[PDB]
Design a protein around this ligand. Structure first.
Ligand code: FES
Length: 98
């Protein structure tokens, strides 16, 4: 399957839509589609690529940085997240972390 992923940059007031394969991480699909997003480690072990879910679900089983409460709050490391449905997510949310 292929899921629609909506990227929202609150500070910039932008909204971009991408199509993401069920077996591709969101960050990779975004870049391929023309949208560069923040990243550093690209391995699920930092917070640079953090985003926050608005709706939809992801599989980010490979991540290691976020604690359970952060995940509960809707945080996602885009570099290692696969969409599991259509998703609405806010990007550039690193600063929200502590
Ligand atoms: S860039 Fe480090 S966890 Fe995604």
């Amino acid at each position: 399957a292929t899921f629609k992923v909506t990227l929202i940059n609150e500070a910039e007031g932008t909204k971009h839509e991408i199509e993401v394969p069920d077996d591709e991480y969101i960050l990779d699909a975004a870049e391929e589609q023309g949208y560069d997003l923040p990243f550093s480690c690209r391995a699920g072990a930092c917070s640079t690529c953090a985003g926050k879910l608005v709706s939809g679900t992801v599989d980010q089983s490979d991540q290691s940085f976020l604690d359970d409460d952060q995940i509960e709050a809707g945080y996602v490391l885009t570099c290692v997240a696969y969409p599991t449905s259509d998703v609405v997510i806010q990007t550039h949310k690193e600063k929200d972390l502590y």
